[PDB]
Amino acid sequence: QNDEVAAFCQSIMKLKTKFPYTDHCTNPGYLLSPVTVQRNMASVKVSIEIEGLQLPVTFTCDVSSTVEIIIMQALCWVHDDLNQVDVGSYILKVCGQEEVLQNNHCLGSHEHIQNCRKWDTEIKLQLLTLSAMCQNLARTAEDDEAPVDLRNIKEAWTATEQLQFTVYAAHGISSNWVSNYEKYYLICSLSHNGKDLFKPIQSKKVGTYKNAAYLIKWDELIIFPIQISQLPLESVLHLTLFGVLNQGPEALGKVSLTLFDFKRFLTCGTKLAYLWTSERIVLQVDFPSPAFDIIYTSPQIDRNIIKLETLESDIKGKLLDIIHRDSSFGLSKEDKVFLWENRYYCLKHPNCLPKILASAPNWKWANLAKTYSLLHQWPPLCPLAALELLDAKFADQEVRSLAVSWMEAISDDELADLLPQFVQALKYEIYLNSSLVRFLLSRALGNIQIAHSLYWLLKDALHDTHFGSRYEHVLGALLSVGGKGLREELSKQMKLVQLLGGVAEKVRQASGSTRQVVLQKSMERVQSFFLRNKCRLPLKPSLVAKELNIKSCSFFSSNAMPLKVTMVNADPLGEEINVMFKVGEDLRQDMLALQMIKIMDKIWLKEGLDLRMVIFRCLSTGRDRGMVELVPASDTLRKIQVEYGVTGSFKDKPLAEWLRKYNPSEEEYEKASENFIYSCAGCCVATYVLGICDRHNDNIMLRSTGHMFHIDFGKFLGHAAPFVLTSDMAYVINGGEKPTIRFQLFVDLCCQAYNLIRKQTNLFLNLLSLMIPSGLPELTSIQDLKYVRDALQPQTTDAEATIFFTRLIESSLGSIATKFN
Ligand SMILES: COc1ccc2c(nc(NC(=O)c3cccnc3)[n+]3cc[nH]c23)c1OC
């Protein structure tokens, strides 16, 4: 490993040379305000603070205007002609946030702008020079110049020797194990493309060695029915150890060994594998040690230029029908063989290549040359299509290297929200240095939001017992390549987390009578933290916390007694920072739900549909702890049904008369009811496809502006009414007791949104598949994907699916449904 780690480090030094501290482009030292590209890009009021004016300039801008001309519009408000001012020196930042608007994007493209439009809040920007902008994260000269720290040959295709090895012993057995388990046995599996090449082979069952209670010795020769010549390069040996109790056999751990190392030489001699439990056991497997090294050599390059062949009508449609099929998922043995033989007819449909490689007969060394020949003349995939080619199913380095090269197309703003899936895809790279990890590190270098998100994702990946060692090295490389400025702020953030994690444990372990006092006392350590530190908020590092507002800090009076942490902004131009910190629940299930809901919002906005969706952030800092964004001026349905329940018992009125008290005027209420119609549609569609079946009045939330959203994603991909519309919901939508065209608008929005997710079925299956190895309780295998596919009714028309969802809505309405048509 020491050799692979050395070459990785020499590769990363070479990567840093492409990102000098001089280039402001890739080394800005500030976060970029995120953008999601929205169609038809309406006007807005923006408020810009200018250097030397007592009040900010407040004017109307076209949402379609680039930030560049917005900056200049703002300069025209103080300057007559702009031949005296250097406009290229100026930037716009969000007020209270170390975030810079991207010049060449529409004002309306920016996440912050469309959030302000949703809530109807003042758009407050600040105009200033690059010179004036906080750049305390930027890489220095020191950073670039600093290092990075975290005899004969026989070609394999000629090697006819049987793959065999001796499973010798495991050393360092616990006192715990000697009591429980009588004998132990290994189950040896050979795998490539995430699938077993043969039946797994079981070791003999042996106890601890005579006069040695810490050592199990098998000294057993395992022989597979395969030759080194038949081994794919990315072939992996898996050894799962089992303890048979004395007084079913029990899985104690698993090691993986790559039969070829990162230099393509076959594993030879004694190799040591470390499997963890809580404690470190050492497994010794002895490989043959011939007089000669064996090296894997790919087949010689096959140069061909294929395009006019036999064109037959009937089968041309059965190919087109398969090409245009929703996804590769569940494709029959016959459809694979048919597509495979017609693969060279599919060169004007790039995004189907994953279906072609999934329909390969095998990955035998002989047949690789003609697969490689296809790939290198194949047209570039769209980045989201190529995600599939980084999954378990495709181990081949040429396939994955191409998949990454096509991915270079993707924007930083699109990549930002896809990172969790990319981090998990590292588990399908057998080698440490790889096209993928270099892509991720390179994107983090050139963008601070990506580096920041990678840090927290990689820190969450460490806790994996099998892949913890791999992620340790990748995090190390990120932190090293990040520079001093970044590392120090990340350390500050990591400290604030541990302290808040500390306070929340202390708060919960306290009694009901003393809990409030324990919080007030426990917050002394974070009080002290801030006296010697200004710290960026981990959930949104554009927000700088200067001080803690101790009198506003509280516990939410729920199980898990979550903290409400109120913090003062280091920017007077900014607002207070309110955020939840919770301990006990694993938040990663919630993070995925929110990710999937956020990608649906992005898909809809890319086709002109805005369903006014509430998109809040959730960060898993440690195992079973993290920060959750607090949406202001919102309450659970139940709290509202309960608070109106005291005045009247009409039951149609609670939501309606709740929205009126905050939206009193006729145009104010109508808008809030419209916000509800659009937000409810998105929520209904998201509820059904993602299979969040466990919704109730404490689960559903409602913002005072009328926007509806989910919060507790306890149930996910439920399998076994999908959503529920109550009378009070129907009342707000209709605007009265009887059905209106507003309910027809609601029905159209649902069905339209539903169809736009169906056209992206493959993306949603790829995004959930890549989160299988992350070990979430409700997502362990491809069968969990089938539900979601089955919900999206593939190979049915938009018109056929509109009737299916319309009947889901009518079904949801319950007994009131009879009143509607
Ligand atoms: C008054 O109580 C709340 C107002 C807003 C809240 C809010 N709670 C929120 N979060 C949650 O309920 C939650 C639970 C489990 C995993 N993720 C989020 N949450 C997320 C976004 N906004 C809000 C209030 O808490 C009851």
Domain containing 807 — which CATH number? Answer: 1.10.1070.11
Token pair for 722: 């999908």
CA of 686 to the centre of ligand 1 (A): 18
Token pair for 649: 């018992």
The Cα–Cα gap between 97 and 575 comes to 9
Q: Is the CB of 579 under 6 A from ligand 1?
A: no
Task: Check which CATH number belongs to the domain holding 444 and give it.
Answer: 1.25.40.70
CA of 631 to the centre of ligand 1 (A): 8
Asked whether 316 and 349 are in contact (CB, 8 A), the reply is no
404 and 478 in a single domain? The answer is yes
Q: Which atom of ligand 1 is closest in space to residue 639's alpha carbon? A: 1
Residue 341 within any structural domain of the chain:
yes
Kindly state the helix (H) or strand (E) to which residue 811 belongs, with its residue range.
Answer: helix 798-813
For a mutational test of ligand 1's pocket, the pick from 580, 710, 716, i.e. the residue with the most ligand atoms closer than 8 A to its C-beta, is: 580
Q: Is the CB of 628 under 6 A from ligand 1?
A: yes
Asked whether 39 and 48 are in contact (CB, 8 A), the reply is no
The Cα–Cα gap between 608 and 296 comes to 51
187 and 112 in a single domain? The answer is no
CA of 106 to the centre of ligand 1 (A): 32
- Residue nearest (by alpha carbon) to ligand 1 atom 12: 711
Domain encompassing residue 748:
589-819
341 and 401 in a single domain? The answer is yes
The Cα–Cα gap between 404 and 617 comes to 28
107 and 195 in a single domain? The answer is no
126 and 170 in a single domain? The answer is no
Residue type at 75?
L
Residue type at 14?
K
List all residues 6 or more positions away from 497 whose beta carbon is below 8 Å from its beta carbon: 538, 621, 622, 625, 627
Helix-, strand-, coil-residue percentages of the chain, each rounded to 5 = 40, 20, 40
Residue 795 within any structural domain of the chain:
yes
169 and 247 in a single domain? The answer is yes
Asked whether 264 and 228 are in contact (CB, 8 A), the reply is no
The Cα–Cα gap between 579 and 618 comes to 10
The Cα–Cα gap between 160 and 189 comes to 20
Residue 511 within any structural domain of the chain:
no
- Residue nearest (by alpha carbon) to ligand 1 atom 19: 630
Residue 80 within any structural domain of the chain:
yes
Number of domains present in the structure of the chain: 4
241 and 323 in a single domain? The answer is no
Domain end marker among 485, 511, 546: 485
Short-list 551, 440, 568, 654, CA closest to 12: 440
Residue 111 within any structural domain of the chain:
yes
Domain end marker among 118, 141, 164: 141
Task: Check which CATH number belongs to the domain holding 122 and give it.
Answer: 3.10.20.90
CA of 202 to the centre of ligand 1 (A): 50
Q: Is the CB of 716 under 6 A from ligand 1?
A: no
133 and 158 in a single domain? The answer is no
CA of 789 to the centre of ligand 1 (A): 29
Domain end marker among 245, 262, 295: 295
Q: Which atom of ligand 1 is closest in space to residue 558's alpha carbon? A: 26
Q: Is the CB of 668 under 6 A from ligand 1?
A: no
In the numeric block, the tokens 């007559």 are attached to 80
Question: For every residue of 42-63, which 3-state class applies, written as one string?
Answer: CEEEEEEECCCCCCCEEEEEEC
Which residues does a chain break follow in the chain (C to N more than 2.5 Å)?
41, 150, 247, 278, 306, 720
CA of 319 to the centre of ligand 1 (A): 49
List all residues 6 or more positions away from 781 whose beta carbon is below 8 Å from its beta carbon: 772
Short-list 554, 573, 748, 616, CA closest to 115: 616
CA of 559 to the centre of ligand 1 (A): 13
How many CA atoms lie less than 13 Å away from 147 in the CB half-sphere?
Answer: 6
Residue 47 within any structural domain of the chain:
yes
The Cα–Cα gap between 815 and 819 comes to 9
128 and 172 in a single domain? The answer is no
Resolution (A): 2.7
CA of 582 to the centre of ligand 1 (A): 11
Token pair for 386: 């190529």
Pairing of strands 123-129, 43-49: parallel
Q: Is the CB of 631 under 6 A from ligand 1?
A: yes
Q: Is the CB of 629 under 6 A from ligand 1?
A: yes
343 and 249 in a single domain? The answer is no
Kindly state the helix (H) or strand (E) to which residue 414 belongs, with its residue range.
Answer: helix 412-416
The Cα–Cα gap between 155 and 482 comes to 40
For residue 627, give Cα distances in angstroms to 10, 83, 586, 740: 37, 48, 12, 42
Kindly state the helix (H) or strand (E) to which residue 115 belongs, with its residue range.
Answer: helix 111-119
- Residue nearest (by alpha carbon) to ligand 1 atom 2: 635
192 and 123 in a single domain? The answer is no
Asked whether 354 and 388 are in contact (CB, 8 A), the reply is yes
660 and 805 in a single domain? The answer is yes
Which residues partner with 545 through β-bridges? 535, 569
CA of 712 to the centre of ligand 1 (A): 8
For a mutational test of ligand 1's pocket, the pick from 658, 703, 711, i.e. the residue with the most ligand atoms closer than 8 A to its C-beta, is: 711
CA of 619 to the centre of ligand 1 (A): 13
Residue 582 within any structural domain of the chain:
no
Residue 566 within any structural domain of the chain:
no
Token pair for 666: 């006729």
Find the length of the chain. 821
Short-list 143, 180, 186, CA closest to 166: 186
